Amino acid sequence: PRGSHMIVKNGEKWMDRYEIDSLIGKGSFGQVVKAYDRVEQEWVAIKIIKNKKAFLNQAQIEVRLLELMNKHDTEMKYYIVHLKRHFMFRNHLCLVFEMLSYNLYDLLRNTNFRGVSLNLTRKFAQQMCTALLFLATPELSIIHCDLKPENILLCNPKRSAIKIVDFGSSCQLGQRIYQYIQSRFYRSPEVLLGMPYDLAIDMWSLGCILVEMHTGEPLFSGANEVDQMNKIVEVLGIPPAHILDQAPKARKFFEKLPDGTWNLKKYKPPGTRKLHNILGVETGGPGGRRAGESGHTVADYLKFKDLILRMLDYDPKTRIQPYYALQHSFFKK
Ligand SMILES: Cc1nc2ccc(-c3cc(N)nc(N)c3)nc2n1CCOc1cccc(Br)n1
């Protein structure tokens, strides 16, 4: 009975149904094992939640949100991982999902972190915006709260079809329970500033993830919250004063002057690290490795950049929503 991780034995069979094959990943929530479902005759990934009350309760919200989504007749709900079923077993909550392939970070690593074609970036972007559109569904209104290349899995290794996983920081509009959510690199300024958030935080993460997908480098690689916020300001400049005026953690990064304006405390100047230059819009793409190449015209790069900057709006209110993002000229065929 010792420790909070399930004692998974390789090859052992549960409820005379699931044959554990191997541990395929760990984390904070617990572990994921590959197992054969002799009853449905298929390979399943079982998320085994730590026998710990905090992770049990959080998992229980994951299950509800997954059972909410996977009952909607939409076809947009095929961008979200399928929850086959869940059960209590050896005092651990087990969520049973479809087996998927590797994540968009493993994909980046496959390319020696040079990033993928703008053409493949677009395919990922359209899929993710449609998932986000699906999550913004009134009867759902789910916020993933932890989008990153790691939580975006491929269905097969050959195809570019993606699904989102890990609804373990996930919540619905009005049911916000953590002040500190998201992965730092993909954490929206409102969350950094400690403000109440909505689904607009997932569109922020998406923007960062998309630029990373094509440059193979995190857009904002902050060591801590002060480094994180500073890196964002480097590119996007000082946030709207109207936002920092309500921002609980405003004074963790900025200072108000007598003038009533904000600036930084004791890096490149605000907004002087142009995304345009990060992307190598006019100098043959990231590291110059897309120079002359098809689908990588200055024009193509401009449309992507414009959509990225609509995703990275400091203002959660004016920041672009999945429906409008799909109607963007980056997607038109
Ligand atoms: C191979 C594979 N198929 C999966 C299907 C679903 C899930 C899955 C995993 C989690 N934490 N939460 C949900 N709701 C679904 N994880 C799968 N994995 C493992 C390789 O990806 C990942 C992704 C995230 C974390 C880890 Br460890 N590993």
UniProtKB/Swiss-Prot annotation:
Annotated active site: D146
Effect seen on changing Y180F: Mildly reduces kinase activity. Does not abolish autophosphorylation on tyrosine residues
Modification Phosphoserine occurs at: S169
Positions where Phosphotyrosine occurs in the chain: Y18, Y36, Y78, Y178, Y180, Y301
Binding-site residues, ATP: I24, G25, K26, G27, S28, F29, G30, Q31, V32, K47, F97, E98, M99, L100
Record: disease: Intellectual developmental disorder, autosomal dominant 7: A disease characterized by primary microcephaly, severe intellectual disability without speech, anxious autistic behavior, and dysmorphic features, including bitemporal narrowing, deep-set eyes, large simple ears, and a pointed nasal tip. Intellectual disability is characterized by significantly below average general intellectual functioning associated with impairments in adaptive behavior and manifested during the developmental period.
Name of this chain's protein: Dual specificity tyrosine-phosphorylation-regulated kinase 1A
Source organism of this protein record: Homo sapiens (Human)
Source lineage: Eukaryota, Metazoa, Chordata, Craniata, Vertebrata
Shown residues in whole-protein numbering: 148 to 481 of 763
